[PDB]
Design an enzyme around this catalytic site. Structure first.
Site, PDB file in Angstrom:
ATOM      1  CD  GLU A  45      37.364 -48.939 -27.015  1.00  0.00           C
ATOM      2  OE1 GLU A  45      36.772 -49.060 -28.107  1.00  0.00           O
ATOM      3  OE2 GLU A  45      36.914 -48.245 -26.082  1.00  0.00           O
ATOM      4  CE  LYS A 101      29.617 -46.633 -46.933  1.00  0.00           C
ATOM      5  NZ  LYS A 101      30.573 -46.612 -48.088  1.00  0.00           N
ATOM      6  CG  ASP A 159      31.934 -49.316 -46.411  1.00  0.00           C
ATOM      7  OD1 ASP A 159      32.665 -48.520 -45.761  1.00  0.00           O
ATOM      8  OD2 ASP A 159      31.596 -49.138 -47.610  1.00  0.00           O
ATOM      9  CG  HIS A 178      25.372 -51.208   1.143  1.00  0.00           C
ATOM     10  ND1 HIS A 178      24.319 -51.575   1.952  1.00  0.00           N
ATOM     11  CD2 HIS A 178      26.494 -51.399   1.875  1.00  0.00           C
ATOM     12  CE1 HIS A 178      24.784 -51.980   3.120  1.00  0.00           C
ATOM     13  NE2 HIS A 178      26.102 -51.883   3.100  1.00  0.00           N
TER      14      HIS A 178
END
Ligand SMILES: [Cl-]
Ligand SMILES: [Cl-]
Ligand code: NA
Ligand code: NA
Lengths: 395, 396, 395, 396
Positions: D96, D231, D306, D396
């Site tokens: 990413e 998990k 993991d 603003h």
């Protein structure tokens, strides 16, 4: 009438009225005061029999009368428990039509098949304050100090009551620099709300002072830090339990299922799986059941339990399983706060309902819990069984 | 007296009594019967002023009498709503001491700070059957057919009711080969439980027959597949809503917080964060609030709503935020099933309590919902403000 | 080396290094800079084949090398889908021993029994900003304005991309005076993260301006208001879905279960119920499954999906049901964000893995989703089947 | 080449190859095989420097090569912990773009504001079997026997391991006649997956035999009953914890927030409330945070944890609070399973990444956990601060 006009001009408030006039007429003045404001006349709320003097002192404020809830019963219900044995006729107060009949049908089937085996798995009441510390470093010290000085905290909490007993402080949650210690009490036969608040307040005042001597400044933000958890649906209650944790079960033969429920064991298992298990999973529900809240609700209103604790009783899991000789059918309610003294059990109509079960007074809360579980099973079986009929037919 | 003995011998059942004898006396007879089984005498449950004949037909079975719940009020409560405007005195039925006093204190503080701004965000009732199909292939076909033929399903559903309108079937959940269509109805001023069950059942029969013409075999396993969700706490209700979705707000100036709540806007914000938000987050709770269930319960019992729906009303989020001019304080209840006709609203004592609100009858369910939200805010403000007082003191 | 010393004295930072030196040597300088600080020498992270110039521009910052994940495969896997048909050999990258073997065993059983039927139930990517309004009154106006001007918002969002399409804004959540609109996009074959952020930002700028003309002041606090929901486990994703929603199923005969799984259909149903359904209910879990995250994880790492989306793929429900002729076994994954272009699919090793499936490039995301579902079923069946053996033996 | 044809004809399976030929060549052969089935050529997956023989025995099956994940670093990151002290450069493996840059920005801001205060709150690994009993009566007996005979179960469990210590069996959940005992172990510096499975299985065999002597028949249905929870995202993990439970904190002065984050403490508090707290509450999320999973994922891949445990690390709560002197900002991650030996830490590229942290080997799992928490805070601070900048501007 001059008082009534001072109520309209708000020179005097409804709350201070009981010292100026008798409490009996205090209710009539309040009832007519709010009648004049709303421009409506009432006939029913003013006609009751419960003790108004004691109700004002323990159960209600600004009393104007009473509401009436229809009261019916379901039975006979044979129960095979540690504390409840024999056949019971269970009172149920509700405004929902067909609910009592559904439970009553379940009670009859269960009794003809040998009754419900039920056990109380756990019995506790909890209070979880939120305590602010200066930093996570102190929050750790605070947690480890609590665990190592538990006997000291236990004596401090128990000095406030003849009836409570502190059995644990677990889990102790920390979020950042805030600590949520779950105080765990035995409460005897009371539900324990007021006792655990008083015992925990003194416990927290003592922790705060003892930690201050060690150069650690903490202070309790609130005695209820929403980790109790009280009157909200929560995973901590589902997992760790609260109030009474109850399990009720029955084994039914295939021929009894065909004869009394007009269905089969595989249909009951299929309905329970598609609806109670899978349906609750995909809608992210905490109630893996069909009917607990309805049955809890009817029984709680009749016996004067706290109405908001129906929230907690709606948690739980129904398991229906095919056996070689029929079905295994069970209900699990990990979070059922009940009491047979104090709270609403003292209001006269609710007292009578507990008397009809032999469950008013001391040494009866566990008996009443077992009755609650057997009643929930009876009604959950009735509803699930009736759905399995339509399931069979439509298939 | 002869019949009493035949009940003890089990020759006749309690349910069969109403036709052999008057229903008034059926109630007294089966009370004698439960008295003789438990070997205890009752004096209070036998007093009731409510209409027993219609109660037996619509509200209860095996009736032996009535339970009495103490009834108080909290007020005055000024509400700035779309449907509720003015000062209200809210009736509350409870056995918990101090609850009415906590709300009564909140109502007065808010009223003289300008009243509660409240809005109904949504208004719908849902029913989600479980439908079994042969496989995910057919389950996909079923979902697409529902989406395609929604107008036809709508006309079948509405043919069963004069007030019910089917406005959506969404979401349509699929697990394996099982399909959970969430039918979304408008119910007028009824809570809608019975209307949406009758309308949804005919709709499902129609879907099943229309699919059979295409050689696709489905069948409804149950009209309630636990995806509704009804009388259980569930994310689908927290997210998509059910019943009335209500939001109430107040803005309070620092000077009003100091004078009436005896605290500050920072402490109120702090309590709400540590308790209502973080505390609920870490205990995996769906109620990010202090008191909704308690207030909902007292109002629901007083006005004849379904007691099991307190479960749904306990969901929601309380927001308290420091503003330049004080604090912003709001409650959000996405899942509040209420009605002003039918169900328990018919019971006489509860009807009178709706009348004290001017909320009995048609075109008043939205007014009642706005009153519910304003009362919850008033009490939620009372509790949180009282906790922030102790908070500040112990900090000093 | 003079640059290296300026890195040690922090006159120059690692981030600005790429303009002073070539990008190839930029990686070596950074690798040796952090080596000198940690007083350790490396041999492996510096030996890779992926394109460092493109990786720096699209996939990583401050690159010092590459990590290597062992790559294996599971197959053959026969799939009966709308987009995937035939036998596939699926690549799986993991550091967990026995995981690939467990899936490979499942693939072989499934293929010998006719393959997996799989379908994509839904396909969308979402972004849910949080918008602040002055009051609940405006929040309602804001919500109703959005719903009635959807076509206008759709044109504004879609003017930012050749590939995205806005299909819905639902649900629209309001908490107090804050509004969480769930924008729902079709993204073609990209996972869509960057496209839905750009399309939604322009959509929100347009809503803010249009509402300002009607004398209603709003402003977006953040384009991700945590209602998306992205890279966290959430009921909204479980219910409404996100990314690809996939269901895979197989029917197995009793004789195939005995021959290939060495068990029975009732044992598989019992294991699934006690573990995947009841066990997840009582621990308040959102994964009513055994193994999705492991299988999702291995397949995502091999094909360059976003690693944090394993969170979303862990959601879902395994249903195992006795049939007259054997079992019905299915997996349901409502929340699987995948893509076959963009993101990490461009890194060279991950591109090859998608090529081995025939799933790199345009018009392939739905095919890849169906493969994901069939692989999860194969592995969930292997694990659940192996547990049912021990279950049978111990009983 | 003759063997390649026998694989295409299915005369031999790919799994059987490692013994007929070298494991080095087994990998190249089965890559040729997958190439010929898919009719596509590969050039990159065949490059690997890692030890293939031990990887085949402990990390992977049917190996054809390796995937390469770009590896960067974020730093410097000053940490004020019990086990991690000084400036660290944290390696992060990801595909990413912009994630490493967001954390790298957070590390620098925190470092020059004094570093991250971090503490490990808890350290344990869990395994919760499903045990079937005949009825709730026996299920109650079973629970009480476990509580009574804990010391004996402890000695049986510890006889299977040199590092594992059984410290508790809590909670012990019962549903109907099924019992889910949560065994709680200390695992040293291992993550503990394999140790707690071997220790728990022998413990369960011992419980089953001891109960049989009392004529109570039980049997373990599965060593993992989904109450661990492993998990998957679950309340039991959010509440009771699993793996390492970590908390990290910083105090930043108003002048540092303005100078380094270009915003104010109010805006940071506001963003955190609306997004991390209310937003997660209304969508029924268990992650009351912005970026945990992203940061956990990059560090887990770089250091060989993991990958499926990113699910567990995505749980937690970010707190941002206005203080008199600035802002208080903390992250809480109750469920972070990490290890510094065994599992994937053995793979060579990931081992080197632990070495860059000084966290490879024994007596370093707690150091590694403190580094994990400090990195999550740094990145969570970077993201939230960047969102509060946009927040102020649009206001603003
Ligand atoms: Cl310390
Ligand atoms: Cl309006
Ligand atoms: Na009537
Ligand atoms: Na090694």
């Amino acid at each position: 009438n001059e008082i009534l006009e001072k109520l309209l001009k708000k020179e005097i408030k409804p709350y201070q009225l009981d010292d100026l006039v008798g409490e009996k007429e205090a209710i009539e003045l309040r009832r007519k005061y709010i009648e004049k404001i709303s421009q409506v006349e009432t006939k029913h709320i003013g006609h009751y029999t419960i003790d108004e003097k004691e109700a004002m002192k323990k159960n209600i404020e600004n009393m104007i009368g009473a509401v009436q809830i229809p009261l019916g019963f379901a039975g006979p219900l044979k129960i095979n428990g540690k504390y409840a044995n024999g056949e019971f006729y269970v009172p149920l107060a509700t405004t929902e039509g067909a609910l009592v009949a559904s439970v009553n049908r379940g009670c009859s089937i269960v009794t003809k098949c040998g009754g419900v085996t039920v056990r109380v798995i756990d019995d506790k009441m909890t209070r979880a304050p939120v305590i602010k510390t200066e930093s996570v470093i102190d929050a750790v010290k605070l947690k480890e100090w609590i665990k190592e000085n538990f006997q000291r905290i236990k004596e401090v909490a128990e000095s406030t009551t003849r009836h409570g007993k502190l059995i644990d402080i677990n889990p102790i949650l920390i979020v950042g620099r805030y600590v949520y210690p779950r105080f765990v009490y035995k409460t005897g036969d009371a539900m324990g709300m007021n006792m655990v608040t008083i015992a925990t307040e003194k416990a927290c005042n003592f922790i705060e002072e003892e930690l201050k001597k060690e150069n650690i400044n903490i202070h309790t933000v609130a005695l209820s830090g929403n980790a109790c958890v009280d009157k909200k649906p929560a995973g901590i209650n589902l997992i760790e339990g609260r109030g009474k944790s109850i399990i009720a079960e029955v084994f039914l033969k295939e021929e009894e299922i065909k004869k009394y429920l007009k269905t089969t064991s595989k249909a009951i298992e299929q309905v329970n799986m598609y609806k109670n298990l899978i349906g609750s999973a995909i809608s992210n529900s905490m109630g893996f059941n069909a009917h607990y809240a309805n049955i809890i609700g009817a029984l709680f209103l009749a016996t004067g339990q706290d109405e908001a604790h129906i929230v907690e009783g709606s948690l739980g899991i129904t398991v229906a399983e095919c056996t070689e000789d029929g079905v295994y059918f069970s209900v699990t309610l990990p979070d059922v706060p009940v009491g047979t003294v104090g709270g609403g059990t003292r209001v006269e109509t609710q007292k009578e309902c507990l008397e009809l079960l032999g469950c008013h007074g001391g040494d009866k809360a566990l008996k009443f819990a077992e009755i609650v579980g057997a009643t929930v099973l009876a009604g959950e079986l009735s509803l699930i069984g009736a759905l399995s009929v339509g399931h069979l037919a439509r298939a």
